[PDB]
């Protein structure tokens, strides 16, 4: 239940 960075989009992604 946190946030991780995703260079394949250059934004943040939520990890449920």
Tell the residue number behind the tokens 């239940």, with chain if given.
1
Method: NMR
User: Contact 1/8 with Cβ under 8 angstroms?
Assistant: no
User: Contact 13/3 with Cβ under 8 angstroms?
Assistant: yes
7 DSSP 8-state letter: T
Residues 6+ apart with CB under 8 A from 14: 2, 3
Residues 6+ apart with CB under 8 A from 13: 3, 4, 5, 6
Question: b/e map of 1-16 (b: 16 or more CB within 10 Å)?
Answer: eeeeeeeeeeeeeeee
User: Contact 5/13 with Cβ under 8 angstroms?
Assistant: yes
User: Contact 13/1 with Cβ under 8 angstroms?
Assistant: no
Rounded Cα distance between 16 and 1, Å, is 5
């Amino acid at each position: 239940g946190e946030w991780t960075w995703d260079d394949a989009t250059k934004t943040w992604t939520w990890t449920e």
